Subunit: 114 residues, 2 copies
């Protein structure tokens, strides 16, 4: 549903605009199942297609940031905005101590200086 | 907050723990993991360089809460230093399962179900 790709041992995900809460969860459960079952070098998630953010999206994004930090998985969030960065820092995302990039490419490159 | 991967509950623990009561903590943890039961519970104390009497108390309590719920259980992220202390203060570690990090613990909790 939400496609999880893997490009050169890196996990790559782009989140589009959603309606069913229950596909984000299908995505999160699926992603967290993937990044634990077999080895990886990092995880880039792009949220450029999202013009706003639920607390639901915000808290799933926090959940994956905290679990990758626990798995020693480099994590980059990309495609961030005005009306996203603000609510993200609001609901509790340490954006300043988080690896962030402008697009899917800058993130891949950023998961590679390490 | 609380994390969950693969039907497995994960409590990551930080030095900000000393700011509620053990009892408030147990009531908080039971709110989260008894709603829908899990196949297990991983407690991560990797963020702990220093353990005191309060922490050992919680760890002792949570480990017991777990089995009371019929819940398989790994204590992960123990500095070899913060582990003698824990046992000196009453955490019978020999009885319970331990793992290096969230990953090895997750692997132990499930590669024990095959």
């Amino acid at each position: 549903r939400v496609p999880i790709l893997k490009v050169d041992d890196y996990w790559v995900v782009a989140i589009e605009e959603t309606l069913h809460d229950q596909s984000v969860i299908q995505f999160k459960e699926e992603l967290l199942h993937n990044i634990t079952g077999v080895a990886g070098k990092g995880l880039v998630i792009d949220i450029s297609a999202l013009e706003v953010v639920d607390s639901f999206v915000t808290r799933v994004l926090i959940e994956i940031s905290r679990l990758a930090e626990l798995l020693g998985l480099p994590f980059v969030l990309t495609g961030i905005k005005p009306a996203v960065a603000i609510t993200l820092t609001e609901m509790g995302l340490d954006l300043r101590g988080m690896a962030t990039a402008l697009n899917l490419q800058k993130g891949l490159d950023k998961l590679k200086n390490l």
